[PDB]
Design an enzyme around this catalytic site. Structure first.
Site, PDB file in Angstrom:
ATOM      1  N   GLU A  36     -10.306  24.378  -6.819  1.00 38.33           N
ATOM      2  CA  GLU A  36      -9.881  23.678  -8.242  1.00 38.33           C
ATOM      3  C   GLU A  36     -10.718  22.455  -8.432  1.00 38.33           C
ATOM      4  O   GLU A  36     -11.105  21.658  -7.497  1.00 38.33           O
ATOM      5  CB  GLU A  36      -8.409  23.127  -8.197  1.00 38.33           C
ATOM      6  CG  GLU A  36      -7.297  24.439  -7.529  1.00 38.33           C
ATOM      7  CD  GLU A  36      -7.306  25.502  -8.617  1.00 38.33           C
ATOM      8  OE1 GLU A  36      -7.719  25.323  -9.755  1.00 38.33           O
ATOM      9  OE2 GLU A  36      -6.767  26.497  -8.267  1.00 38.33           O
ATOM     10  N   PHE A  88     -15.723   7.828   0.182  1.00 34.05           N
ATOM     11  CA  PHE A  88     -16.538   7.110   0.848  1.00 34.05           C
ATOM     12  C   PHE A  88     -16.618   7.446   2.185  1.00 34.05           C
ATOM     13  O   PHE A  88     -17.642   7.995   2.869  1.00 34.05           O
ATOM     14  CB  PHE A  88     -16.348   5.644   0.569  1.00 34.05           C
ATOM     15  CG  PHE A  88     -17.288   5.003   1.232  1.00 34.05           C
ATOM     16  CD1 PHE A  88     -18.523   4.542   0.988  1.00 34.05           C
ATOM     17  CD2 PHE A  88     -17.089   4.470   2.443  1.00 34.05           C
ATOM     18  CE1 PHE A  88     -19.325   3.533   1.857  1.00 34.05           C
ATOM     19  CE2 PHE A  88     -17.795   3.624   3.160  1.00 34.05           C
ATOM     20  CZ  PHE A  88     -19.061   3.059   2.883  1.00 34.05           C
ATOM     21  N   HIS A  89     -15.510   7.338   2.815  1.00 33.26           N
ATOM     22  CA  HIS A  89     -15.339   7.642   4.206  1.00 33.26           C
ATOM     23  C   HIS A  89     -15.707   9.109   4.464  1.00 33.26           C
ATOM     24  O   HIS A  89     -16.601   9.184   5.495  1.00 33.26           O
ATOM     25  CB  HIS A  89     -13.805   7.476   4.793  1.00 33.26           C
ATOM     26  CG  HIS A  89     -13.606   8.038   6.203  1.00 33.26           C
ATOM     27  ND1 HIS A  89     -13.344   9.367   6.482  1.00 33.26           N
ATOM     28  CD2 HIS A  89     -14.015   7.363   7.287  1.00 33.26           C
ATOM     29  CE1 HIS A  89     -13.546   9.563   7.716  1.00 33.26           C
ATOM     30  NE2 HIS A  89     -13.840   8.515   8.393  1.00 33.26           N
ATOM     31  N   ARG A 128       1.142  -1.277  -0.078  1.00 34.42           N
ATOM     32  CA  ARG A 128       0.087  -0.069   0.087  1.00 34.42           C
ATOM     33  C   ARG A 128       0.864   1.259  -0.110  1.00 34.42           C
ATOM     34  O   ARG A 128       1.546   1.406   0.909  1.00 34.42           O
ATOM     35  CB  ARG A 128      -0.895  -0.035   1.014  1.00 34.42           C
ATOM     36  CG  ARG A 128      -1.856   1.247   1.539  1.00 34.42           C
ATOM     37  CD  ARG A 128      -1.027   2.304   2.448  1.00 34.42           C
ATOM     38  NE  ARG A 128      -2.125   3.154   2.761  1.00 34.42           N
ATOM     39  CZ  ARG A 128      -1.706   4.332   3.071  1.00 34.42           C
ATOM     40  NH1 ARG A 128      -0.433   4.634   3.548  1.00 34.42           N
ATOM     41  NH2 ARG A 128      -2.628   5.378   3.464  1.00 34.42           N
ATOM     42  N   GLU A 162      -2.646   5.344  -2.085  1.00 33.87           N
ATOM     43  CA  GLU A 162      -3.317   6.463  -1.364  1.00 33.87           C
ATOM     44  C   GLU A 162      -2.853   7.728  -2.056  1.00 33.87           C
ATOM     45  O   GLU A 162      -2.063   8.268  -2.081  1.00 33.87           O
ATOM     46  CB  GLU A 162      -2.894   6.579   0.163  1.00 33.87           C
ATOM     47  CG  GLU A 162      -3.733   7.726   0.838  1.00 33.87           C
ATOM     48  CD  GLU A 162      -3.028   8.113   2.051  1.00 33.87           C
ATOM     49  OE1 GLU A 162      -1.421   8.272   1.994  1.00 33.87           O
ATOM     50  OE2 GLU A 162      -3.643   8.536   3.129  1.00 33.87           O
ATOM     51  N   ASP A 207     -11.280   7.653  -0.257  1.00 31.83           N
ATOM     52  CA  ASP A 207     -11.489   8.321   0.873  1.00 31.83           C
ATOM     53  C   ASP A 207     -12.951   9.065   0.917  1.00 31.83           C
ATOM     54  O   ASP A 207     -13.560   9.398   1.674  1.00 31.83           O
ATOM     55  CB  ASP A 207     -10.386   9.415   1.259  1.00 31.83           C
ATOM     56  CG  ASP A 207      -9.079   8.833   1.580  1.00 31.83           C
ATOM     57  OD1 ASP A 207      -8.468   7.936   0.843  1.00 31.83           O
ATOM     58  OD2 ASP A 207      -8.303   9.213   2.589  1.00 31.83           O
ATOM     59  N   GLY A 212      -6.811   8.801  13.750  1.00 27.76           N
ATOM     60  CA  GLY A 212      -5.547   9.192  14.335  1.00 27.76           C
ATOM     61  C   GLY A 212      -5.172  11.005  14.004  1.00 27.76           C
ATOM     62  O   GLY A 212      -4.645  11.456  15.035  1.00 27.76           O
ATOM     63  N   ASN A 213      -5.751  11.372  12.863  1.00 24.67           N
ATOM     64  CA  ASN A 213      -5.778  12.649  12.539  1.00 24.67           C
ATOM     65  C   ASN A 213      -6.461  13.619  13.475  1.00 24.67           C
ATOM     66  O   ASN A 213      -6.015  14.911  13.274  1.00 24.67           O
ATOM     67  CB  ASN A 213      -5.686  12.921  11.261  1.00 24.67           C
ATOM     68  CG  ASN A 213      -7.134  13.147  10.499  1.00 24.67           C
ATOM     69  OD1 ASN A 213      -8.205  13.233  11.528  1.00 24.67           O
ATOM     70  ND2 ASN A 213      -7.271  12.998   9.347  1.00 24.67           N
ATOM     71  N   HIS A 227      -6.429   4.328  10.030  1.00 24.35           N
ATOM     72  CA  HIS A 227      -5.266   5.054  11.194  1.00 24.35           C
ATOM     73  C   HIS A 227      -5.271   6.708  11.088  1.00 24.35           C
ATOM     74  O   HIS A 227      -5.418   7.329  12.002  1.00 24.35           O
ATOM     75  CB  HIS A 227      -3.817   4.528  10.866  1.00 24.35           C
ATOM     76  CG  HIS A 227      -3.320   5.233   9.629  1.00 24.35           C
ATOM     77  ND1 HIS A 227      -3.357   4.504   8.387  1.00 24.35           N
ATOM     78  CD2 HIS A 227      -2.522   6.406   9.448  1.00 24.35           C
ATOM     79  CE1 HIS A 227      -2.516   5.153   7.556  1.00 24.35           C
ATOM     80  NE2 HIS A 227      -2.105   6.432   8.118  1.00 24.35           N
ATOM     81  N   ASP A 287       1.790   4.825   0.470  1.00 22.26           N
ATOM     82  CA  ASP A 287       1.325   6.139   0.974  1.00 22.26           C
ATOM     83  C   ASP A 287       1.536   7.456   0.228  1.00 22.26           C
ATOM     84  O   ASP A 287       2.420   7.466  -0.425  1.00 22.26           O
ATOM     85  CB  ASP A 287       2.432   6.377   2.339  1.00 22.26           C
ATOM     86  CG  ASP A 287       2.007   7.483   3.175  1.00 22.26           C
ATOM     87  OD1 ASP A 287       0.939   7.788   3.765  1.00 22.26           O
ATOM     88  OD2 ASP A 287       2.881   8.698   3.126  1.00 22.26           O
TER      89      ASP A 287
HETATM   90 CL   LIG Z   1      -8.610  11.661  -0.696  1.00 18.81          CL
HETATM   91 MG   LIG Z   2      -7.652   8.015  -2.906  1.00 14.32          MG
HETATM   92 MG   LIG Z   3      -8.161  26.874 -11.288  1.00 14.50          MG
HETATM   93 MG   LIG Z   4      -2.997  12.728   1.676  1.00 17.96          MG
END
Ligand SMILES: [Cl-]
Ligand SMILES: [Mg+2]
Ligand SMILES: [Mg+2]
Ligand SMILES: [Mg+2]
Ligand SMILES: [Cl-]
Ligand SMILES: [Cl-]
Ligand SMILES: [Cl-]
Ligand SMILES: [Mg+2]
Ligand SMILES: [Mg+2]
Ligand SMILES: [Mg+2]
Length: 584
Positions: free
Chosen positions: A366, A319-320, A254, A291, A317, A391-392, A387, A256
Site C-alpha cells: 500500500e 531515519f533509523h 511521548r 510514535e 523511524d 529490544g525487538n 528501546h 506510543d
Molecule cells: Cl515507522
Molecule cells: Mg513515525
Molecule cells: Mg491498495
Molecule cells: Mg508500531
C-alpha cells in the site's frame, strides 16, 4: 489534577471515590478492610464520599459477586497491580523548583531511559544520582519509558494497566515527583512515554467492571481496542495525559503507537487530547511527541510563527531504519522497505523528513506516507537506537555490536549534528554493548503465553534461542554497566558524545527556530555514501558521510568545518568518515 475516575480529595477532609462499572448492578468500596456500599448515580457510574480519610489509606472495590479489584484509576498501589490501591495526597510533595518553565523544543536532545535497568537499584530515587552526569553530557530532555503499573516487578512498561499509577517497583508518587523536580534543577526537561492504545494482560479488571470499555470487533495486536467513543472511556483516556502533565509537572509526553488508536468520533481522541493540553497548560512549553508508522503530518501542523497547536514532533523511524540497512546490511521484515538503495532513503530522510512520502511500501503493498518537505526540521525525532530497535531483536543487540565502533561513531555524529531532533538510547553515550532484552515478570499460563508468543516472533529464524522474558537474568543482562561508563574506553565515548552536543547547541540549534520548512537537498549518494545540504535563513548546513572501505570525492560543501572525523581531507572523504560544514 481533578479526574472523573478514581479517588480524589473534594475537600480538605473528604475523599470522593468514583468508578464506572456498566457490567455491575452494585459495587462496594472496601476502605481499610471495611465495606461501604457505593451509590449508583446514573449511566453506570458509582460514587461514594467518605469523610476523614487520610493519605495512604488502602482501598479496593468489591463487585456484585465478591471479586476484589484495584481502582482502575488508582494513583498508587500498595504493592502489586492486583492489590490495594491507596489514597494519594497531591500536596504531600513540596516542589522546590517551581520557577522551572521549560525550554524551547529547538534545543531538545532526548535521552530515552528505562527506570528499572538505568541503575542497579532500578528506582526513581537511584536515577536522581545520575542526573548531574546527564546534564553535564548535554542531554536536555529525559524520556522515561512507561511507568503505569503493570503485572510483576520488571517490565518495559507497555503492559501497563493502571494508567494513572506510577509502578510501585520504581517508587512512590512522591519519589517520581522528586526525580522530576531534581531533573528540573539540573536543567533537564522530563517527558513520559504514555500508552493509550491498549492495556496489558495482568491486572486489568476494566473488562469485568464495564465490558463496554472495549469494542466488540476492534483488536490491536496486543489487546482489545478501546471504545474511545463511549463518554466514560473517553474521560479515562483523555484525563490520563492531562493528569500526568499537571500532577507530575512534566514537560511533555511521548504517545506510543498512535497508529493503533482508532476512533470514529467526529473529533479524534488524539486531537482532543492535544487541544485540551494547549488550552489547559500555558505557563511552559509542553512537548508532545508521537510514535506513528503512517508517515502522516496532519497531527503536527505549525502556524505562521512556528507554534505547534497539536503535536510537537513525530518519531521518524525511517531515519533509523534506513541507517540500519545502510550500516548493517540487514533487510528482513520492516527493513526490507529500505533494501533498495538504503543510501537514497537515508539521504531523503535527512533532507526531507520521511523516506516514504506516498510511495508503495514493499512490506504492505500500500502507499505509505505523505509529502513532508513543508514540515520544519524540528517536527521529526530521529534516532540510531531506541528501546524497540534494540529490544525487538531476539538477542537485544545494540547497533555498536552490529555495525562496529568506528561506523557507530560516524552515525552518532551524523545524528547529533543533523537538524532533526535527536534521541539517544540510554548507554549509547559511553558505548554500552550490553543488550536491551525484552523482559517481563509474569507467572502461570500468562508467563508461558508471553514466552512462547515471543519465541514465535522468531520461529522463522529457527536456530534462535530467545531468552525467556520472565527470567530474572534477562532483566539483569539489560542493566546499564556503569563500570564501563567509568572505564577509559567509556570516557572516550563520553568525551566524543559531549563534544558533539556542545557543537550542536553552539552551531546547529541557532539555525532551527527560523526554519519553517525542510529546506533540505540531497546533493549526491552512492553505495555507502551520502551528501546533504540544508538551506536555512541563518546559514547553509552540509553533511557528508562515507561508510565504504574507500575514499570518495565530495561535492562542494560551502563554509567552515564544524566537525570532521577522523580527519578532514580537501575535496574527498576517507573511508569510515564524516564531514559537517556551515556557511554563514
Ligand atoms: Cl515507522
Ligand atoms: Mg513515525
Ligand atoms: Mg491498495
Ligand atoms: Mg508500531
Ligand atoms: Cl517550544
Ligand atoms: Cl508547546
Ligand atoms: Cl549502539
Ligand atoms: Mg496539603
Ligand atoms: Mg546546555
Ligand atoms: Mg517556538
Amino acid at each position: 489534577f481533578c479526574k472523573s475516575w478514581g479517588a480524589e480529595y473534594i475537600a480538605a477532609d473528604v475523599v470522593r471515590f468514583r468508578l464506572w462499572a456498566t457490567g455491575q448492578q452494585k459495587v462496594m468500596l472496601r476502605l481499610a478492610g471495611k465495606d461501604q456500599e457505593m451509590q449508583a448515580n446514573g449511566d453506570g457510574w458509582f460514587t461514594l464520599d467518605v469523610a476523614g480519610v487520610t493519605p495512604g489509606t488502602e482501598y479496593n472495590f468489591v463487585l456484585s459477586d465478591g471479586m476484589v479489584v484495584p481502582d482502575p484509576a488508582s494513583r498508587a498501589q500498595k504493592t502489586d497491580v492486583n492489590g490495594p490501591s491507596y489514597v494519594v495526597d497531591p500536596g504531600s510533595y513540596t516542589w522546590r523548583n517551581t520557577g522551572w518553565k521549560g525550554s524551547r523544543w529547538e534545543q531538545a536532545v532526548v535521552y530515552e531511559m528505562h527506570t528499572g535497568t538505568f541503575t542497579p537499584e532500578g528506582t526513581f530515587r537511584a536515577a536522581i544520582a545520575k542526573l548531574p552526569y546527564l546534564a553535564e553530557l548535554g542531554v536536555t530532555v529525559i524520556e522515561v519509558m512507561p511507568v503505569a503499573q503493570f503485572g510483576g516487578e520488571r517490565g518495559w512498561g507497555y503492559d501497563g494497566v493502571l494508567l494513572y499509577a506510577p509502578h510501585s517497583a520504581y517508587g512512590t508518587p512522591d519519589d517520581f515527583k522528586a526525580f522530576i523536580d531534581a531533573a528540573h534543577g539540573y536543567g533537564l526537561s522530563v517527558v513520559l512515554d504514555i500508552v493509550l492504545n491498549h492495556f496489558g494482560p495482568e491486572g486489568n479488571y476494566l473488562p469485568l467492571l464495564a465490558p463496554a470499555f472495549f469494542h466488540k470487533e476492534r483488536m490491536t495486536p496486543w489487546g482489545n481496542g478501546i471504545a474511545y467513543d463511549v463518554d466514560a472511556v473517553r474521560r479515562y483516556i483523555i484525563e490520563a495525559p492531562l493528569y500526568w502533565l499537571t500532577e507530575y509537572h512534566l514537560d511533555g509526553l511521548r504517545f506510543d503507537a498512535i497508529d493503533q488508536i482508532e476512533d470514529s468520533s467526529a473529533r479524534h481522541v488524539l486531537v482532543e487530547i492535544a487541544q485540551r493540553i494547549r488550552e489547559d497548560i500555558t505557563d511552559r512549553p509542553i512537548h508532545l511527541t508521537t510514535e506513528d508508522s503512517r508517515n502522516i503530518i496532519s497531527l503536527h501542523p505549525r502556524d505562521q510563527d512556528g507554534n505547534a497547536p497539536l503535536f510537537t514532533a513525530e518519531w521518524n523511524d525511517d531515519f533509523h531504519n534506513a541507517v540500519h540497512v545502510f550500516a548493517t546490511g540487514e533487510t528482513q521484515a520492516y527493513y526490507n522497505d529500505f533494501a533498495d538503495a538504503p543510501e537514497k532513503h537515508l539521504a531523503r530522510a535527512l533532507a526531507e523528513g520521511f523516506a516514504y512520502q506516498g510511495e508503495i511500501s514493499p512490506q504492505t503493498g500500500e502507499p505509505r506516507g505523505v509529502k513532508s518537505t513543508g514540515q520544519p526540521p524540528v517536527a521529526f525525532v530521529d534516532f540510531i537506537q531506541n528501546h524497540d530497535q534494540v529490544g525487538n531483536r531476539a538477542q537485544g543487540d545494540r547497533l555498536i555490536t552490529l555495525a562496529g565502533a568506528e561506523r557507530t561513531k560516524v552515525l552518532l555524529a551524523t545524528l547529533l549534528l543533523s537538524p532533526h531532533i535527536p534521541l539517544l538510547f540510554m548507554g549509547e553515550e559511553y558505548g554500552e554493548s550490553r543488550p536491551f532484552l525484552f523482559f517481563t515478570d509474569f507467572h502461570g499460563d500468562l508467563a508461558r503465553a508471553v514466552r512462547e508468543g515471543r519465541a514465535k516472533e522468531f520461529a522463522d529464524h529457527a536456530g534462535e534461542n530467545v531468552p525467556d522474558p520472565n527470567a530474572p537474568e534477562t532483566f539483569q543482562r539489560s542493566k546499564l554497566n556503569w563500570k564501563q561508563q567509568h572505564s577509559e574506553e567509556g570516557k572516550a565515548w563520553l568525551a566524543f558524545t559531549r563534544e558533539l552536543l556542545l557543537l550542536r547547541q553552539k552551531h546547529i540549534v541557532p539555525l532551527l527556530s527560523a526554519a519553517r520548512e525542510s529546506s533540505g537537498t540531497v546533493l549526491q549518494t552512492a553505495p555507502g555514501f551520502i551528501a546533504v545540504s540544508w538551506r536555512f535563513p541563518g546559514g547553509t548546513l552540509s553533511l557528508a558521510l562515507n561508510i565504504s572501505a574507500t575514499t570518495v570525492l565530495l561535492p562542494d560543501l560551502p563554509g567552515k568545518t564544524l566537525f570532521a572525523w577522523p580527519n578532514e581531507s580537501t575535496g574527498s572523504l576517507s573511508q569510515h568518515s564524516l564531514i559537517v560544514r556551515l556557511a554563514q
